[PDB]
Design a protein around this ligand. Sequence first.
Ligand SMILES: *[C@@H]1O[C@H](CO)[C@@H](O[C@@H]2O[C@H](CO)[C@@H](O)[C@H](O)[C@H]2NC(C)=O)[C@H](O)[C@H]1NC(C)=O
Ligand SMILES: *[C@@H]1O[C@H](CO)[C@@H](O[C@@H]2O[C@H](CO)[C@@H](O)[C@H](O)[C@H]2NC(C)=O)[C@H](O)[C@H]1NC(C)=O
Ligand SMILES: *[C@@H]1O[C@H](CO)[C@@H](O)[C@H](O)[C@H]1NC(C)=O
Ligand SMILES: *[C@@H]1O[C@H](CO)[C@@H](O)[C@H](O)[C@H]1NC(C)=O
Ligand SMILES: [Ca+2]
Ligand SMILES: [Ca+2]
Ligand SMILES: [Ca+2]
Ligand SMILES: [Cl-]
Ligand SMILES: [Cl-]
Ligand SMILES: [Cl-]
Length: 609
Amino acid sequence: PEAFLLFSRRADIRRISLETNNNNVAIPLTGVKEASALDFDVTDNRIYWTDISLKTISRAFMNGSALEHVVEFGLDYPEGMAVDWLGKNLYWADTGTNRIEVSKLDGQHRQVLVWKDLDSPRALALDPAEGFMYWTEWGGKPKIDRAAMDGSERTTLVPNVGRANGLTIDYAKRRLYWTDLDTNLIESSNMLGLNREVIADDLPHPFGLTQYQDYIYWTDWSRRSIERANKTSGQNRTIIQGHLDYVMDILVFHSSRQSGWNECASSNGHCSHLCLAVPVGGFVCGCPAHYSLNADNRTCSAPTTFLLFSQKSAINRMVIDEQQSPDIILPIHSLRNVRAIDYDPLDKQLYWIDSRQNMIRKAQEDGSQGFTVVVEIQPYDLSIDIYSRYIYWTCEATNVINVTRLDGRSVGVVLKGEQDRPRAVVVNPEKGYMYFTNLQERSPKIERAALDGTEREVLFFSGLSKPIALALDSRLGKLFWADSDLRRIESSDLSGANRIVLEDSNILQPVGLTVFENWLYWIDKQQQMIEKIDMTGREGRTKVQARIAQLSDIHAVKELNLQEYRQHPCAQDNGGCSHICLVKGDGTTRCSCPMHLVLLQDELSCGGT
Ligand SMILES: *[C@@H]1O[C@H](CO)[C@@H](O[C@@H]2O[C@H](CO)[C@@H](O)[C@H](O)[C@H]2NC(C)=O)[C@H](O)[C@H]1NC(C)=O
Ligand SMILES: *[C@@H]1O[C@H](CO)[C@@H](O[C@@H]2O[C@H](CO)[C@@H](O)[C@H](O)[C@H]2NC(C)=O)[C@H](O)[C@H]1NC(C)=O
Ligand SMILES: *[C@@H]1O[C@H](CO)[C@@H](O)[C@H](O)[C@H]1NC(C)=O
Ligand SMILES: *[C@@H]1O[C@H](CO)[C@@H](O)[C@H](O)[C@H]1NC(C)=O
Ligand SMILES: [Ca+2]
Ligand SMILES: [Ca+2]
Ligand SMILES: [Ca+2]
Ligand SMILES: [Cl-]
Ligand SMILES: [Cl-]
Ligand SMILES: [Cl-]
């Protein structure tokens, strides 16, 4: 097989033949803005690249076909990237997010492997046959680190270096090569970071490096060239190609650079998701972010409970766990201005309002199955009745509470009055009630009504100025709200009894709130904070996360007890009801209708007028 050298420069990935240096061509890719890190896969001759301007990681065949973005969310500066050709994983280092991550080569099952005490990780190199990965860190005190390829047993391998790049392993000879931008040289060590030897010096900015057979190849920005030298002696130096300024990466493309074996074998180690190499020649089964590995050490389980929080253009998920796993961005396309979110735990689908396009949309957490539920309306807030399978939502333009089935079929309006201004809304189908803020002129109110709009009552009319967020927790039997003018968070029993102020200090702009276990979580848009308060009163107010821009909503997802769920009388085929099914205070469950219809004598069906 003829070996080739690939390199990135500007928006191009170019190929040079190491047998005939004159032959230089561009790989036929479209849509590239800035080609950065490069790699390939020996199995199928796909090329992989990062684009630090577009914030993506992509792949394609060398003929340009099957071009796809395998990572396109939650990146900032993906400067390091490598293919694990044995486990069939993609690894990357993001200098902006300070994370080292992994996924399958097609982008599935993304997981964060390193995220704590990480300062500008840059050049990544993998040794899947041995089960170790290596990377450089710039930032405060530059160093080269090593970890197992599942992220475990992280150590500093080389503590005394300048800003290092082009980290490359000679797998045949068991040596690690890198460039040093500050000491102005290329050097190598053994795999333990010992027996260091300078190969070439007087290189003001050796930015890229690779190795093939007896030669190293590098590019120095001051020389504007790609050069080659003997890897051991540093002699026999020649120019491969000149007049190449600011080359970002170089890669020897040849099958001998992706050899060896490991115990993942041809079966992904029988791991359900990720097969991650660990020393020596072995593996562990890995899981997507927030999943847990089952007792069998092979299969993964999705998180049973988590918190969602939205920004203007992102929906994020976080978990509370012993590892303190990091928050992730959900890969949901076409977000523009997310105003409010909800989640259906039965079908595992995220719902949101987008205020740019005035729509209610849904998708799976992995981004698939995107669908428009409601589309001059102006949705403000939404709340899912997970038993009856419909969404209650407020319209800021017509000032109604409308009800729409999850599949988009309208049920109809349950609240409308000439002076009514329904805004925040939350349903409690366990008891048959909905709760809403009513921002009536000169008299804001918190109200409730049965889920068909009957039995309307004002719970609170005093001590309200701009109640902007509303939440409830059926287990605690409590209602919660936040006022952005009085700058406080309050609570009461769901009946309206026992109103209390939870917090009235250091609140600026409390735009959402949610209950997770015994904690009330809220988001403050101005302070850019998620914070929590302990409802048992034992622990103090605690900061959860800071510096989150454009916060819009927060939503806790409890674990769904499927047996309890199916015991809800509206859970089986909407209790036989054509429109609304609801629990009543007298202990019965009944069918009812939106405002334009009446219940017929069968007590199941609604008819006109
Ligand atoms: C581009 O290159 C790829 C990889 O060499 C080609 O993919 C093959 O396509 C054929 C028929 O379409 C299949 O039988 C093979 O299974 C594919 N191979 C792999 C590794 O995926 C693709 O055909 C090429 N495209 C062009 C236009 O030449
Ligand atoms: C409540 O929302 C539904 C959408 O879920 C609205 O239904 C639309 O009504 C318009 C005319 O008013 C029709 O052109 C559309 O075809 C309807 N869409 C669907 C999916 O049925 C309904 O108008 C809303 N009701 C109120 C009172 O605002
Ligand atoms: C590289 O240098 C080493 C040490 O001097 C020598 O043994 C080897 O033959 C050289 N290889 C090439 C390809 O020049
Ligand atoms: C799973 O691995 C753990 C150690 O991580 C070990 O104690 C246990 O025996 C393993 N269980 C199975 C079923 O392989
Ligand atoms: Ca590289
Ligand atoms: Ca320098
Ligand atoms: Ca809500
Ligand atoms: Cl050292
Ligand atoms: Cl009151
Ligand atoms: Cl809530």
